[PDB]
Design a protein around this ligand. Structure first.
Ligand SMILES: *[C@@H]1O[C@H](CO)[C@@H](O[C@@H]2O[C@H](CO)[C@@H](O)[C@H](O)[C@H]2NC(C)=O)[C@H](O)[C@H]1NC(C)=O
Ligand SMILES: *[C@@H]1O[C@H](CO[C@@H]2O[C@@H](C)[C@@H](O)[C@@H](O)[C@@H]2O)[C@@H](O)[C@H](O)[C@H]1NC(C)=O
Lengths: 22, 40
């Protein structure tokens, strides 16, 4: 599975490693 | 001068205020979103 005009991409709260732990 | 200059926009980001309820305390912790700590 595969700018700077005020647009932001917030990060998820559960990182992919923590999801893998779940 | 025949030289090439890249232009990067000046840093910006949202400001969030992490706060326990005013009913409990009044200290706050300010999160500056997506800015390296030096730039503040
Ligand atoms: C703040 O400074 C830079 C910019 O965000 C980061 O650390 C540098 O990252 C660059 C990669 O773009 C490296 O080439 C440098 O070697 C890194 N260190 C320095 C001192 O420039 C990081 O975000 C933050 N680093 C520090 C030390 O606060
Ligand atoms: C809101 O707080 C009320 C009393 O708070 C008191 O004062 C603050 C500064 C703290 O020291 C706290 O520990 C004290 O109890 C109470 O009605 C209750 O704790 C809270 N009620 C609601 C609805 O949030």
């Amino acid at each position: 599975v595969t700018k700077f005009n005020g647009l932001t991409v917030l990060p998820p709260l559960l990182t992919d490693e923590m999801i893998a732990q779940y | 001068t025949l030289e090439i200059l890249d232009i990067t926009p000046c840093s910006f980001g949202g400001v969030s205020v992490i706060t326990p309820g005013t009913n409990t305390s009044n200290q706050v912790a300010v999160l500056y979103q997506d800015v390296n700590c030096t730039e503040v």
